[PDB]
Design a protein around this ligand. Structure first.
Ligand SMILES: [Ca+2]
Length: 279
């Protein structure tokens, strides 16, 4: 399948070169997979989600996304126009309030929720969780992310936007999950992207167009935007039967575009998420 005039990040993820504008992918499109977006919520009524998104949990007075961030990330995972895995099932878990803030205890509870809740969902092709969030190092936050991964969920987490070593942030620093840095449309490490040995992969993160609340769209930047590219890529590959939740991060690293990013600090992987789709 070919989507013309796609957001640059989608085109990037199916290309061996920067500078193109068509996204190419297998029509299976993540059907039969599930992605949990653990964030500020998802505006499930957005036409871009086509009835494939729903809120399954909130820790606040509403499950509505009053911020936009979770909706944007969910759109990069699975919206019809802005998404990597255009037929996946999207599940919103609102651990972040409408200001985009959340206590670590809430975030941990949300991760343990997803590990159990997947057993209440139909995801025959497998389950992914996208965590575009983080704070300072916490062993308990890392452990929760490790449990979620261990439970059979492909966990993708933002490296963080501090232009610093991700070793000092959680859940970024949890080794067993997939820690995602950000790149721009010219294949530079994004200016704000964290780096370090703990990164597994980079995805598009600067100037990413996606869904927003009020049935809208906008472009924003962050490792928060790179993460759902990788989460959607995992769901797509799992639907194709090419990998599993336990092995998807490794598979993505194995099959990445290698050595093509600039301003990657010595000791950080130079690997850019790539679907290796050939028609
Ligand atoms: Ca890792």
């Amino acid at each position: 399948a070919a989507q013309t005039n796609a957001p640059w990040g989608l085109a990037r993820i199916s290309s061996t070169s920067p500078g193109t504008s068509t996204y190419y992918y297998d029509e299976s499109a993540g059907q039969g997979s599930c992605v949990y977006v653990i964030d500020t919520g998802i505006e499930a009524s957005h036409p871009e989600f086509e009835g494939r998104a729903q809120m399954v949990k909130t820790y606040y007075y509403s499950s509505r996304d009053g911020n936009g961030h979770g909706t944007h990330c969910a759109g990069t995972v699975g919206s019809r126009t802005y998404g990597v895995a255009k037929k996946t099932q999207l599940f919103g878990v609102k651990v972040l309030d409408d200001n985009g803030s959340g206590q670590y205890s809430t975030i941990i509870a949300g991760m343990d929720f997803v590990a159990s809740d997947k057993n209440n969902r139909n995801c025959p092709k497998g389950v992914v969780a996208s965590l575009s969030l983080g704070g300072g190092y916490s062993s308990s936050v890392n452990s929760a992310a490790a449990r979620l991964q261990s439970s059979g969920v492909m966990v993708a987490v933002a490296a963080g936007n501090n232009n610093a070593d991700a070793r000092n942030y959680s859940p970024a620093s949890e080794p067993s999950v997939c820690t995602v840095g950000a790149s721009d449309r010219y294949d530079r490490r994004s200016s704000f992207s964290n780096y370090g040995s703990v990164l597994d992969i980079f995805g598009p993160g600067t100037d990413i167009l996606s869904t927003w609340i009020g049935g809208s769209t906008r472009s924003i930047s962050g490792t928060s935007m790179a993460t759902p590219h990788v989460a959607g890529l995992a769901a797509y590959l799992m639907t194709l039967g090419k990998t599993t939740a336990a092995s998807a991060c490794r598979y993505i690293a194995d099959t990445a575009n290698k050595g093509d990013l600039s301003n990657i600090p010595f000791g950080t992987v130079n690997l850019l998420a790539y679907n290796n789709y050939q028609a």
